[PDB]
mmCIF file of all heavy atoms in Angstrom:
data_model
loop_
_atom_site.group_PDB
_atom_site.id
_atom_site.type_symbol
_atom_site.label_atom_id
_atom_site.label_comp_id
_atom_site.label_asym_id
_atom_site.label_seq_id
_atom_site.Cartn_x
_atom_site.Cartn_y
_atom_site.Cartn_z
ATOM 1 N N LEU A 1 3.449 -2.151 -10.581
ATOM 2 C CA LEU A 1 4.559 -2.363 -9.566
ATOM 3 C C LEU A 1 4.344 -3.581 -8.733
ATOM 4 O O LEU A 1 4.297 -3.595 -7.534
ATOM 5 C CB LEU A 1 4.672 -1.165 -8.692
ATOM 6 C CG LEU A 1 5.057 0.123 -9.409
ATOM 7 C CD1 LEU A 1 5.083 1.348 -8.461
ATOM 8 C CD2 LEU A 1 6.393 -0.011 -10.148
ATOM 9 N N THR A 2 4.080 -4.747 -9.423
ATOM 10 C CA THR A 2 3.964 -5.998 -8.779
ATOM 11 C C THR A 2 4.811 -7.066 -9.393
ATOM 12 O O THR A 2 5.640 -6.689 -10.295
ATOM 13 C CB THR A 2 2.477 -6.516 -8.837
ATOM 14 O OG1 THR A 2 2.083 -6.549 -10.239
ATOM 15 C CG2 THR A 2 1.539 -5.658 -8.059
ATOM 16 N N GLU A 3 4.739 -8.281 -9.027
ATOM 17 C CA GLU A 3 5.505 -9.287 -9.624
ATOM 18 C C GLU A 3 4.997 -9.655 -11.036
ATOM 19 O O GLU A 3 5.844 -10.018 -11.934
ATOM 20 C CB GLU A 3 5.469 -10.620 -8.799
ATOM 21 C CG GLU A 3 6.432 -10.508 -7.567
ATOM 22 C CD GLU A 3 6.494 -11.838 -6.826
ATOM 23 O OE1 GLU A 3 5.539 -12.577 -6.876
ATOM 24 O OE2 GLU A 3 7.464 -12.080 -6.109
ATOM 25 N N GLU A 4 3.716 -9.478 -11.301
ATOM 26 C CA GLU A 4 3.217 -9.648 -12.635
ATOM 27 C C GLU A 4 3.677 -8.488 -13.570
ATOM 28 O O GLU A 4 3.965 -8.720 -14.745
ATOM 29 C CB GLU A 4 1.662 -9.706 -12.640
ATOM 30 C CG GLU A 4 1.115 -10.839 -11.913
ATOM 31 C CD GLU A 4 1.135 -10.672 -10.358
ATOM 32 O OE1 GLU A 4 1.319 -9.535 -9.920
ATOM 33 O OE2 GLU A 4 1.037 -11.737 -9.587
ATOM 34 N N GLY A 5 3.767 -7.282 -13.064
ATOM 35 C CA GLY A 5 4.164 -6.127 -13.827
ATOM 36 C C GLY A 5 5.541 -6.233 -14.292
ATOM 37 O O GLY A 5 5.867 -6.056 -15.483
ATOM 38 N N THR A 6 6.483 -6.604 -13.477
ATOM 39 C CA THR A 6 7.869 -6.711 -13.791
ATOM 40 C C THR A 6 8.239 -7.893 -14.719
ATOM 41 O O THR A 6 9.279 -7.902 -15.354
ATOM 42 C CB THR A 6 8.782 -6.797 -12.576
ATOM 43 O OG1 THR A 6 8.547 -8.101 -11.950
ATOM 44 C CG2 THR A 6 8.391 -5.665 -11.596
ATOM 45 N N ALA A 7 7.298 -8.876 -14.828
ATOM 46 C CA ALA A 7 7.522 -9.967 -15.694
ATOM 47 C C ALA A 7 7.201 -9.694 -17.149
ATOM 48 O O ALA A 7 7.492 -10.529 -18.050
ATOM 49 C CB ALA A 7 6.743 -11.182 -15.232
ATOM 50 N N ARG A 8 6.580 -8.500 -17.397
ATOM 51 C CA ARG A 8 6.223 -8.171 -18.801
ATOM 52 C C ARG A 8 7.351 -7.557 -19.536
ATOM 53 O O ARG A 8 7.154 -7.243 -20.719
ATOM 54 C CB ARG A 8 4.932 -7.297 -18.843
ATOM 55 C CG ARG A 8 3.774 -7.865 -18.100
ATOM 56 C CD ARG A 8 2.525 -6.995 -18.271
ATOM 57 N NE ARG A 8 1.364 -7.534 -17.536
ATOM 58 C CZ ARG A 8 0.881 -7.011 -16.397
ATOM 59 N NH1 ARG A 8 1.425 -5.997 -15.821
ATOM 60 N NH2 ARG A 8 -0.096 -7.558 -15.811
ATOM 61 N N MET A 9 8.436 -7.208 -18.914
ATOM 62 C CA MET A 9 9.450 -6.430 -19.533
ATOM 63 C C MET A 9 10.109 -7.240 -20.669
ATOM 64 O O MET A 9 10.391 -6.724 -21.731
ATOM 65 C CB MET A 9 10.538 -6.022 -18.555
ATOM 66 C CG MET A 9 10.022 -5.035 -17.534
ATOM 67 S SD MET A 9 9.298 -3.519 -18.088
ATOM 68 C CE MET A 9 7.557 -3.809 -17.994
ATOM 69 N N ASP A 10 10.422 -8.545 -20.446
ATOM 70 C CA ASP A 10 11.071 -9.356 -21.436
ATOM 71 C C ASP A 10 10.056 -9.586 -22.571
ATOM 72 O O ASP A 10 10.498 -9.672 -23.783
ATOM 73 C CB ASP A 10 11.495 -10.703 -20.907
ATOM 74 C CG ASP A 10 12.549 -10.556 -19.796
ATOM 75 O OD1 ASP A 10 12.943 -9.401 -19.524
ATOM 76 O OD2 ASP A 10 12.968 -11.593 -19.171
ATOM 77 N N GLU A 11 8.810 -9.745 -22.294
ATOM 78 C CA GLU A 11 7.821 -9.956 -23.341
ATOM 79 C C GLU A 11 7.751 -8.747 -24.305
ATOM 80 O O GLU A 11 7.627 -8.934 -25.588
ATOM 81 C CB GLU A 11 6.435 -10.179 -22.757
ATOM 82 C CG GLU A 11 6.379 -11.428 -21.863
ATOM 83 C CD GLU A 11 5.066 -11.574 -21.214
ATOM 84 O OE1 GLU A 11 4.059 -10.885 -21.558
ATOM 85 O OE2 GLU A 11 4.911 -12.444 -20.248
ATOM 86 N N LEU A 12 7.832 -7.530 -23.780
ATOM 87 C CA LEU A 12 7.762 -6.303 -24.652
ATOM 88 C C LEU A 12 8.975 -6.319 -25.526
ATOM 89 O O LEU A 12 8.835 -6.000 -26.723
ATOM 90 C CB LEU A 12 7.713 -4.991 -23.769
ATOM 91 C CG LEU A 12 6.488 -4.862 -23.002
ATOM 92 C CD1 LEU A 12 6.585 -3.629 -22.153
ATOM 93 C CD2 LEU A 12 5.326 -4.762 -23.938
ATOM 94 N N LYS A 13 10.215 -6.582 -25.035
ATOM 95 C CA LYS A 13 11.390 -6.584 -25.904
ATOM 96 C C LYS A 13 11.346 -7.656 -26.936
ATOM 97 O O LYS A 13 11.678 -7.433 -28.145
ATOM 98 C CB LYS A 13 12.611 -6.830 -25.070
ATOM 99 C CG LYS A 13 12.675 -5.726 -23.833
ATOM 100 C CD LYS A 13 13.747 -6.060 -22.902
ATOM 101 C CE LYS A 13 15.074 -5.777 -23.534
ATOM 102 N NZ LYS A 13 15.192 -4.336 -24.059
ATOM 103 N N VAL A 14 10.831 -8.819 -26.592
ATOM 104 C CA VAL A 14 10.669 -9.899 -27.530
ATOM 105 C C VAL A 14 9.664 -9.525 -28.658
ATOM 106 O O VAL A 14 9.935 -9.713 -29.888
ATOM 107 C CB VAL A 14 10.227 -11.193 -26.907
ATOM 108 C CG1 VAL A 14 9.858 -12.270 -27.922
ATOM 109 C CG2 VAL A 14 11.381 -11.793 -26.077
ATOM 110 N N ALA A 15 8.549 -8.951 -28.280
ATOM 111 C CA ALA A 15 7.529 -8.498 -29.206
ATOM 112 C C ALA A 15 8.035 -7.471 -30.170
ATOM 113 O O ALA A 15 7.793 -7.532 -31.378
ATOM 114 C CB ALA A 15 6.260 -8.015 -28.467
ATOM 115 N N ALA A 16 8.784 -6.475 -29.656
ATOM 116 C CA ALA A 16 9.341 -5.412 -30.525
ATOM 117 C C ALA A 16 10.320 -6.033 -31.488
ATOM 118 O O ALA A 16 10.332 -5.663 -32.720
ATOM 119 C CB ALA A 16 9.917 -4.309 -29.710
ATOM 120 N N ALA A 17 11.211 -6.898 -30.989
ATOM 121 C CA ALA A 17 12.217 -7.505 -31.804
ATOM 122 C C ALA A 17 11.595 -8.346 -32.938
ATOM 123 O O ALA A 17 12.135 -8.447 -34.035
ATOM 124 C CB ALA A 17 13.210 -8.331 -31.037
ATOM 125 N N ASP A 18 10.513 -8.969 -32.605
ATOM 126 C CA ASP A 18 9.780 -9.793 -33.631
ATOM 127 C C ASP A 18 9.029 -8.971 -34.637
ATOM 128 O O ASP A 18 8.939 -9.289 -35.820
ATOM 129 C CB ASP A 18 8.851 -10.790 -32.946
ATOM 130 C CG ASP A 18 9.588 -11.880 -32.256
ATOM 131 O OD1 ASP A 18 10.838 -11.889 -32.248
ATOM 132 O OD2 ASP A 18 8.925 -12.694 -31.570
ATOM 133 N N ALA A 19 8.553 -7.758 -34.165
ATOM 134 C CA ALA A 19 7.895 -6.883 -35.121
ATOM 135 C C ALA A 19 8.932 -6.226 -36.058
ATOM 136 O O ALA A 19 8.567 -6.001 -37.257
ATOM 137 C CB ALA A 19 7.151 -5.824 -34.327
ATOM 138 N N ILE A 20 10.045 -5.978 -35.636
ATOM 139 C CA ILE A 20 11.118 -5.417 -36.480
ATOM 140 C C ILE A 20 11.554 -6.468 -37.557
ATOM 141 O O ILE A 20 11.901 -6.079 -38.672
ATOM 142 C CB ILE A 20 12.274 -4.905 -35.651
ATOM 143 C CG1 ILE A 20 11.912 -3.706 -34.921
ATOM 144 C CG2 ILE A 20 13.499 -4.521 -36.594
ATOM 145 C CD1 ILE A 20 12.972 -3.152 -34.035
ATOM 146 N N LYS A 21 11.509 -7.759 -37.262
ATOM 147 C CA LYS A 21 12.056 -8.802 -38.072
ATOM 148 C C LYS A 21 11.408 -8.748 -39.490
ATOM 149 O O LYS A 21 10.205 -8.678 -39.603
ATOM 150 C CB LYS A 21 11.835 -10.165 -37.457
ATOM 151 C CG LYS A 21 12.182 -11.249 -38.323
ATOM 152 C CD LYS A 21 11.155 -12.522 -38.052
ATOM 153 C CE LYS A 21 11.180 -12.866 -36.507
ATOM 154 N NZ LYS A 21 10.246 -14.007 -36.318
ATOM 155 N N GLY A 22 12.245 -8.861 -40.498
ATOM 156 C CA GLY A 22 11.807 -8.856 -41.847
ATOM 157 C C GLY A 22 11.436 -7.502 -42.484
ATOM 158 O O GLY A 22 11.029 -7.514 -43.599
ATOM 159 N N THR A 23 11.811 -6.440 -41.797
ATOM 160 C CA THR A 23 11.392 -5.051 -42.237
ATOM 161 C C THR A 23 12.620 -4.296 -42.507
ATOM 162 O O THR A 23 13.737 -4.710 -42.103
ATOM 163 C CB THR A 23 10.502 -4.397 -41.275
ATOM 164 O OG1 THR A 23 11.123 -4.310 -39.972
ATOM 165 C CG2 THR A 23 9.182 -5.139 -41.045
ATOM 166 N N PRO A 24 12.567 -3.105 -43.093
ATOM 167 C CA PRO A 24 13.749 -2.230 -43.179
ATOM 168 C C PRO A 24 14.273 -1.768 -41.893
ATOM 169 O O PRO A 24 15.396 -1.219 -41.849
ATOM 170 C CB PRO A 24 13.244 -1.057 -44.060
ATOM 171 C CG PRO A 24 12.162 -1.537 -44.912
ATOM 172 C CD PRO A 24 11.463 -2.605 -43.987
ATOM 173 N N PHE A 25 13.486 -1.908 -40.815
ATOM 174 C CA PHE A 25 14.010 -1.513 -39.486
ATOM 175 C C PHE A 25 14.966 -2.512 -38.923
ATOM 176 O O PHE A 25 15.532 -2.284 -37.781
ATOM 177 C CB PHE A 25 12.789 -1.477 -38.553
ATOM 178 C CG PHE A 25 12.154 -0.092 -38.466
ATOM 179 C CD1 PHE A 25 11.750 0.520 -39.685
ATOM 180 C CD2 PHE A 25 11.864 0.519 -37.312
ATOM 181 C CE1 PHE A 25 11.143 1.715 -39.649
ATOM 182 C CE2 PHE A 25 11.185 1.694 -37.247
ATOM 183 C CZ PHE A 25 10.882 2.329 -38.467
ATOM 184 N N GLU A 26 15.355 -3.547 -39.595
ATOM 185 C CA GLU A 26 16.270 -4.495 -39.121
ATOM 186 C C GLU A 26 17.643 -3.834 -38.785
ATOM 187 O O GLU A 26 18.092 -3.019 -39.624
ATOM 188 C CB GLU A 26 16.530 -5.643 -40.154
ATOM 189 C CG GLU A 26 15.528 -6.770 -39.976
ATOM 190 C CD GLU A 26 15.708 -7.834 -41.090
ATOM 191 O OE1 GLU A 26 16.519 -7.581 -42.079
ATOM 192 O OE2 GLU A 26 15.168 -8.969 -40.942
ATOM 193 N N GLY A 27 18.232 -4.216 -37.665
ATOM 194 C CA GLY A 27 19.397 -3.555 -37.107
ATOM 195 C C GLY A 27 19.148 -2.436 -36.168
ATOM 196 O O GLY A 27 20.053 -1.799 -35.796
ATOM 197 N N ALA A 28 17.923 -2.163 -35.880
ATOM 198 C CA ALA A 28 17.547 -1.111 -34.921
ATOM 199 C C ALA A 28 17.909 -1.544 -33.513
ATOM 200 O O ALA A 28 18.142 -2.692 -33.177
ATOM 201 C CB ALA A 28 16.064 -0.788 -34.974
ATOM 202 N N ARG A 29 17.929 -0.594 -32.581
ATOM 203 C CA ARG A 29 18.291 -0.721 -31.212
ATOM 204 C C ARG A 29 17.075 -0.417 -30.388
ATOM 205 O O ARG A 29 16.461 0.649 -30.506
ATOM 206 C CB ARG A 29 19.489 0.115 -30.810
ATOM 207 C CG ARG A 29 20.779 -0.399 -31.522
ATOM 208 C CD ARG A 29 21.821 0.724 -31.494
ATOM 209 N NE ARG A 29 21.437 1.838 -32.316
ATOM 210 C CZ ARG A 29 21.579 1.864 -33.673
ATOM 211 N NH1 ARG A 29 21.987 0.882 -34.331
ATOM 212 N NH2 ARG A 29 21.238 2.966 -34.314
ATOM 213 N N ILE A 30 16.756 -1.319 -29.403
ATOM 214 C CA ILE A 30 15.540 -1.175 -28.519
ATOM 215 C C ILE A 30 15.949 -0.871 -27.186
ATOM 216 O O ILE A 30 16.799 -1.627 -26.614
ATOM 217 C CB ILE A 30 14.729 -2.440 -28.693
ATOM 218 C CG1 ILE A 30 14.437 -2.811 -30.150
ATOM 219 C CG2 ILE A 30 13.409 -2.263 -27.923
ATOM 220 C CD1 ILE A 30 13.825 -4.157 -30.300
ATOM 221 N N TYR A 31 15.414 0.159 -26.574
ATOM 222 C CA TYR A 31 15.691 0.632 -25.203
ATOM 223 C C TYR A 31 14.365 0.667 -24.433
ATOM 224 O O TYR A 31 13.389 1.266 -24.968
ATOM 225 C CB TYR A 31 16.406 1.934 -25.122
ATOM 226 C CG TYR A 31 17.711 2.063 -25.904
ATOM 227 C CD1 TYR A 31 17.756 2.223 -27.226
ATOM 228 C CD2 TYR A 31 18.946 1.930 -25.191
ATOM 229 C CE1 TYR A 31 18.948 2.319 -27.929
ATOM 230 C CE2 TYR A 31 20.100 1.995 -25.854
ATOM 231 C CZ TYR A 31 20.109 2.140 -27.238
ATOM 232 O OH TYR A 31 21.384 2.229 -27.870
ATOM 233 N N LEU A 32 14.315 0.036 -23.277
ATOM 234 C CA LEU A 32 13.165 -0.041 -22.570
ATOM 235 C C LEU A 32 13.424 0.498 -21.126
ATOM 236 O O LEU A 32 14.376 0.045 -20.428
ATOM 237 C CB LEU A 32 12.607 -1.426 -22.382
ATOM 238 C CG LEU A 32 11.331 -1.666 -21.602
ATOM 239 C CD1 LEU A 32 10.232 -0.747 -22.136
ATOM 240 C CD2 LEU A 32 10.923 -3.137 -21.666
ATOM 241 N N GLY A 33 12.590 1.451 -20.652
ATOM 242 C CA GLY A 33 12.812 2.078 -19.319
ATOM 243 C C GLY A 33 11.434 2.329 -18.686
ATOM 244 O O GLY A 33 10.336 2.314 -19.320
ATOM 245 N N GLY A 34 11.502 2.747 -17.448
ATOM 246 C CA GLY A 34 10.338 3.082 -16.693
ATOM 247 C C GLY A 34 10.435 2.507 -15.264
ATOM 248 O O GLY A 34 11.434 2.015 -14.868
ATOM 249 N N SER A 35 9.234 2.606 -14.511
ATOM 250 C CA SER A 35 9.295 2.158 -13.150
ATOM 251 C C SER A 35 9.379 0.585 -13.113
ATOM 252 O O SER A 35 10.170 0.049 -12.306
ATOM 253 C CB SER A 35 8.056 2.632 -12.484
ATOM 254 O OG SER A 35 7.966 4.007 -12.396
ATOM 255 N N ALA A 36 8.613 -0.131 -13.941
ATOM 256 C CA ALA A 36 8.592 -1.537 -13.897
ATOM 257 C C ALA A 36 9.973 -2.129 -14.319
ATOM 258 O O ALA A 36 10.378 -3.126 -13.673
ATOM 259 C CB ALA A 36 7.531 -2.082 -14.825
ATOM 260 N N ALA A 37 10.601 -1.587 -15.260
ATOM 261 C CA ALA A 37 11.923 -2.031 -15.670
ATOM 262 C C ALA A 37 12.928 -1.843 -14.555
ATOM 263 O O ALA A 37 13.719 -2.677 -14.220
ATOM 264 C CB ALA A 37 12.334 -1.343 -16.927
ATOM 265 N N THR A 38 12.843 -0.634 -13.906
ATOM 266 C CA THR A 38 13.735 -0.401 -12.754
ATOM 267 C C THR A 38 13.512 -1.400 -11.655
ATOM 268 O O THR A 38 14.580 -1.895 -11.143
ATOM 269 C CB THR A 38 13.437 1.072 -12.197
ATOM 270 O OG1 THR A 38 13.844 2.025 -13.234
ATOM 271 C CG2 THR A 38 14.122 1.242 -10.937
ATOM 272 N N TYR A 39 12.335 -1.723 -11.353
ATOM 273 C CA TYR A 39 12.119 -2.685 -10.192
ATOM 274 C C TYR A 39 12.435 -4.142 -10.655
ATOM 275 O O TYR A 39 12.825 -4.937 -9.821
ATOM 276 C CB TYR A 39 10.685 -2.600 -9.707
ATOM 277 C CG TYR A 39 10.510 -1.354 -8.850
ATOM 278 C CD1 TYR A 39 9.736 -0.279 -9.212
ATOM 279 C CD2 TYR A 39 11.268 -1.198 -7.682
ATOM 280 C CE1 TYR A 39 9.545 0.770 -8.502
ATOM 281 C CE2 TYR A 39 11.141 -0.071 -6.803
ATOM 282 C CZ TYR A 39 10.269 0.964 -7.352
ATOM 283 O OH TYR A 39 10.161 2.014 -6.513
ATOM 284 N N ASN A 40 12.332 -4.451 -11.975
ATOM 285 C CA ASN A 40 12.815 -5.737 -12.461
ATOM 286 C C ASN A 40 14.276 -5.895 -12.170
ATOM 287 O O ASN A 40 14.744 -6.909 -11.696
ATOM 288 C CB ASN A 40 12.412 -5.826 -13.942
ATOM 289 C CG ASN A 40 12.903 -7.125 -14.491
ATOM 290 O OD1 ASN A 40 12.494 -8.179 -14.206
ATOM 291 N ND2 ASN A 40 13.890 -6.989 -15.491
ATOM 292 N N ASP A 41 15.065 -4.825 -12.571
ATOM 293 C CA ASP A 41 16.453 -4.873 -12.361
ATOM 294 C C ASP A 41 16.776 -4.878 -10.847
ATOM 295 O O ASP A 41 17.711 -5.577 -10.424
ATOM 296 C CB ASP A 41 17.100 -3.641 -12.997
ATOM 297 C CG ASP A 41 17.128 -3.649 -14.508
ATOM 298 O OD1 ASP A 41 16.836 -4.722 -15.013
ATOM 299 O OD2 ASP A 41 17.439 -2.608 -15.086
ATOM 300 N N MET A 42 16.013 -4.146 -9.997
ATOM 301 C CA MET A 42 16.193 -4.233 -8.573
ATOM 302 C C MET A 42 16.007 -5.579 -8.029
ATOM 303 O O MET A 42 16.797 -6.107 -7.185
ATOM 304 C CB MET A 42 15.211 -3.247 -7.904
ATOM 305 C CG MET A 42 15.488 -1.758 -8.172
ATOM 306 S SD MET A 42 16.955 -1.175 -7.265
ATOM 307 C CE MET A 42 18.144 -1.149 -8.607
ATOM 308 N N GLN A 43 14.998 -6.321 -8.558
ATOM 309 C CA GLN A 43 14.769 -7.633 -8.029
ATOM 310 C C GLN A 43 15.859 -8.634 -8.353
ATOM 311 O O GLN A 43 16.283 -9.433 -7.616
ATOM 312 C CB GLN A 43 13.440 -8.250 -8.552
ATOM 313 C CG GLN A 43 13.062 -9.568 -8.039
ATOM 314 C CD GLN A 43 12.852 -9.483 -6.564
ATOM 315 O OE1 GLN A 43 12.151 -8.670 -5.958
ATOM 316 N NE2 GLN A 43 13.594 -10.426 -5.806
ATOM 317 N N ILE A 44 16.411 -8.535 -9.673
ATOM 318 C CA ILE A 44 17.533 -9.420 -10.017
ATOM 319 C C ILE A 44 18.708 -9.122 -9.226
ATOM 320 O O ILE A 44 19.395 -10.088 -8.632
ATOM 321 C CB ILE A 44 17.791 -9.192 -11.539
ATOM 322 C CG1 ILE A 44 16.618 -9.616 -12.391
ATOM 323 C CG2 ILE A 44 19.073 -9.919 -11.914
ATOM 324 C CD1 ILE A 44 16.713 -9.376 -13.857
ATOM 325 N N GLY A 45 19.045 -7.792 -9.017
ATOM 326 C CA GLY A 45 20.152 -7.396 -8.130
ATOM 327 C C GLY A 45 19.996 -7.995 -6.709
ATOM 328 O O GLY A 45 20.971 -8.421 -6.127
#
């Protein structure tokens, strides 16, 4: 729950999207939630 913690949310989504790339999982939908994501959205708002 810091500024470093909330900055990892985009990295996780990018990493998952890159892991899916080139596999039969292509076209999947990625949902990310939790305390850190909530506070990331809070900071943007």
Side-chain angles (χ1 to χ4, degrees):
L1 299 177
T2 55
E3 282 184 338
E4 297 77 18
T6 68
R8 304 187 181 106
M9 299 298 104
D10 297 358
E11 299 175 11
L12 291 179
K13 309 172 70 54
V14 170
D18 291 357
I20 292 181
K21 171 215 304 180
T23 58
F25 272 49
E26 274 178 346
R29 292 161 293 281
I30 308 169
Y31 300 83
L32 182 56
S35 299
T38 290
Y39 285 114
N40 176 69
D41 291 348
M42 290 288 102
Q43 185 61 51
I44 296 173

